[PDB]
Design brief:
monomer, Ubiquitin-like (UB roll), five-stranded mixed β-sheet, 1 helix, 5 strands, globular, protein binding, Ubiquitin superfold, UBX, unusual N-terminal feature, monomeric
Length: 89
C-alpha cells in the first residue's frame, strides 16, 4: 500500500510533526490519533529521495520523551502530543 497523503478529515483534530533539516530543509508531517507511524515508513519512502537514508529523529518536548509507536493506532503510543519536533541531520 502507500498513502503519500495520509491526512485526517478537516472535521477532526490531528497531530503535526514538523521536521527541519540542518541544511535548510523543511517537511511538515501530519498524523492522526488513531493512525499509526507504521504508515510513516511509506511516507519517507514516498518522498525521501534527497535523504536516501539520512539520520533523522523526532521527539516530544512536552513530556520530554522519545516517540516510539508500534503498528496499531497512532496515539496509542501515549506520545500523542499533537505537535512533535523532528530534527534532520
Amino acid at each position: 500500500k502507500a498513502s503519500s497523503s495520509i491526512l485526517i478529515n478537516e472535521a477532526e483534530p490531528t497531530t503535526n510533526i514538523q521536521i527541519r533539516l540542518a541544511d535548510g530543509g523543511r517537511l511538515v508531517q501530519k498524523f492522526n490519533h488513531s493512525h499509526r507511524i507504521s504508515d510513516i515508513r511509506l511516507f519517507i519512502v514516498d518522498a525521501r529521495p534527497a535523504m536516501a537514508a539520512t539520520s533523522f529523529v523526532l521527539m516530544t518536548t512536552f513530556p520530554n520523551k522519545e516517540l516510539a509507536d508500534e503498528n496499531q493506532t497512532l496515539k496509542e503510543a501515549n506520545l500523542l502530543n499533537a505537535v512533535i519536533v523532528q530534527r534532520l541531520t
